[PDB]
Amino acid sequence: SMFLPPPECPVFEPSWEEFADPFAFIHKIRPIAEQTGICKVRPPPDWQPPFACDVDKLHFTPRIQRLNELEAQTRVKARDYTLRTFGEMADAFKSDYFNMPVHMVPTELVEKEFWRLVSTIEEDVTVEYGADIASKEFGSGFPVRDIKLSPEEEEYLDSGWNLNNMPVMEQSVLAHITADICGMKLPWLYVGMCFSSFCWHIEDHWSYSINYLHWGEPKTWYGVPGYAAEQLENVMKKLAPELFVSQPDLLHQLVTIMNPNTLMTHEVPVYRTNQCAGEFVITFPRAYHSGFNQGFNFAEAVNFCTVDWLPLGRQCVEHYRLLHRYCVFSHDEMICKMASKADVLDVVVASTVQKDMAIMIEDEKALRETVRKLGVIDSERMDFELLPDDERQCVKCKTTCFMSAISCSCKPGLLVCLHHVKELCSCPPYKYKLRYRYTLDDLYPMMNALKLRAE
Ligand SMILES: CCOC(=O)c1c(-c2cccs2)csc1N
Numbered sequence: 001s002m003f004l005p006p007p008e009c010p011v012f013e014p015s016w017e018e019f020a021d022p023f024a025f026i027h028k029i030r031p032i033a034e035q036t037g038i039c040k041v042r043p044p045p046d047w048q049p050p051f052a053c054d055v056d057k058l059h060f061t062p063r064i065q066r067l068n069e070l071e072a073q074t075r076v077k078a079r080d081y082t083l084r085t086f087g088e089m090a091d092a093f094k095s096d097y098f099n100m101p102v103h104m105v106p107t108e109l110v111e112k113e114f115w116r117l118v119s120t121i122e123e124d125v126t127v128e129y130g131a132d133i134a135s136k137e138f139g140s141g142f143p144v145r146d147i148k149l150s151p152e153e154e155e156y157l158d159s160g161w162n163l164n165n166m167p168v169m170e171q172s173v174l175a176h177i178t179a180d181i182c183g184m185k186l187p188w189l190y191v192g193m194c195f196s197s198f199c200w201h202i203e204d205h206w207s208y209s210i211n212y213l214h215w216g217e218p219k220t221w222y223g224v225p226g227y228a229a230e231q232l233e234n235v236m237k238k239l240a241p242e243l244f245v246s247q248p249d250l251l252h253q254l255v256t257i258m259n260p261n262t263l264m265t266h267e268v269p270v271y272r273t274n275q276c277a278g279e280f281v282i283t284f285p286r287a288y289h290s291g292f293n294q295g296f297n298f299a300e301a302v303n304f305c306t307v308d309w310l311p312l313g314r315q316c317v318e319h320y321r322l323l324h325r326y327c328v329f330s331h332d333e334m335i336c337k338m339a340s341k342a343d344v345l346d347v348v349v350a351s352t353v354q355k356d357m358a359i360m361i362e363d364e365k366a367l368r369e370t371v372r373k374l375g376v377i378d379s380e381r382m383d384f385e386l387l388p389d390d391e392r393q394c395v396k397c398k399t400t401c402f403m404s405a406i407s408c409s410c411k412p413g414l415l416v417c418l419h420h421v422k423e424l425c426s427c428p429p430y431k432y433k434l435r436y437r438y439t440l441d442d443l444y445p446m447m448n449a450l451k452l453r454a455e
């Protein structure tokens with residue numbers, strides 16, 4: 001009556017046969033899981049990667065967090081904890097909060113209590129946590145190559161479900177990206193304590209994500225399917241409009257805690273789960289999610305993109321343009337990079353890339369015709385992929401340019417995409433230059449190579 005828990009999301013227990021190939025399995029459950037936004041995966045009982053670490057030599061800098069509903073927080077980017085000293089702090093905190101041993105505090109109660117304390121202005125509970133990509137002071141919880149390994153660790157070295165491997169796995173089109181986009185393709189490590197929370201969000205470029213809980217107390221999740229993303233945003237806009245004022249950077253995105261019952265009252269479908277140690281949660285493209293930790297724990301998560309995602313990735317960049325939001329990478333650049341490697345591509349990949357490329361080319365044709373009729377006549381080839389990203393964003397909409405852009409000798413170094421030709425400066429169009437990566441005649445043979453590889 002104070003808190004009504006959302007219905008449970010789907011839970012999968014694949015056989016060893018199904019579990020062998022992660023991407024085939026994900027594709028299998030997709031028609032179910034994409035209806036709920038999140039889903040949980042229980043590995044076969046055998047599958048138990050060796051977690052081993054020294055709690056005294058792993059150090060990290062803690063982030064601090066206030067727990068207030070609808071209050072703005074900034075997406076993550078001093079002091080120092082070891083894994084042991086943080087664990088001691090976290091267990092003492094939970095123990096003193098409930099005056100109970102930690103394992104006897106029911107998960108139902110922590111959930112009820114979380115939503116009570118974030119709503120009450122009178123309570124000012126703050127908590128700490130760890131969040132960073134893997135490094136020398138604190139590294140992956142999965143086995144990696146270096147130090148000699150035991151026969152069990154090397155079994156799990158090349159698993160698909162070893163999350164270090166999906167940044168470079170082939171069915172993930174993110175693997176082929178040449179640009180170092182560390183924040184996005186490398187795994188993040190998360191050290192939780194009781195009530196530490198991740199706000200409502202979707203992934204950059206509407207990618208998938210996958211989260212593994214290595215050990216410790218459970219992680220509670222709320223998820224919304226991708227088809228309801230904009231319903232959720234309209235509810236958020238009405239109840240907390242400050243979160244929507246234009247962000248200066250992509251290191252200035254604002255997010256918040258919000259009760260799922262509030263969303264359910266406004267007809268947004270929400271699902272929940274408790275993720276325990278040894279379990280995976282998977283999020284689908286544009287599926288909103290949030291949650292909190294029940295106690296001291298350690299998780300590891302990574303973004304990825306299947307061939308299924310390619311059309312959504314294009315729609316997402318279009319959506320970023322309307323919103324004037326920064327991109328993490330150029331989607332078109334990624335497509336052309338794969339086309340240029342067509343001979344070594346997986347054939348299903350090749351077929352799906354070909355379809356996206358065909359849309360890209362037809363859209364680019366129409367845009368070039370439009371700017372020609374605006375009086376832009378001069379043109380020159382330009383290798384956009386050699387420019388630092390901050391040197392090739394459209395002045396107006398902030399999109400990362402790759403296929404083409406307009407420049408002018410008047411504003412040296414500035415660019416606009418072909419949608420915003422009128423937003424560069426006050427000179428007449430004949431002083432402008434179309435800068436392009438490829439002619440249409442370069443592009444049709446690149447697409448043809450994909451067609452041949454796909455057969
Ligand atoms: C509070 C510890 O972090 C977590 O539990 C997280 C987070 C984040 C925490 C802080 C920023 S983003 C994302 S996904 C997950 N499991």
Ligand SMILES: [Cl-]
Nearest residue numbers: 117118120123
């Ligand atoms: Cl509060």
Ligand SMILES: [Mn+2]
Nearest residue numbers: 201202203209
């Ligand atoms: Mn996420």
Ligand SMILES: [Zn+2]
Nearest residue numbers: 408410425427
């Ligand atoms: Zn000018």
Ligand SMILES: [Zn+2]
Nearest residue numbers: 394397417420
């Ligand atoms: Zn633009």
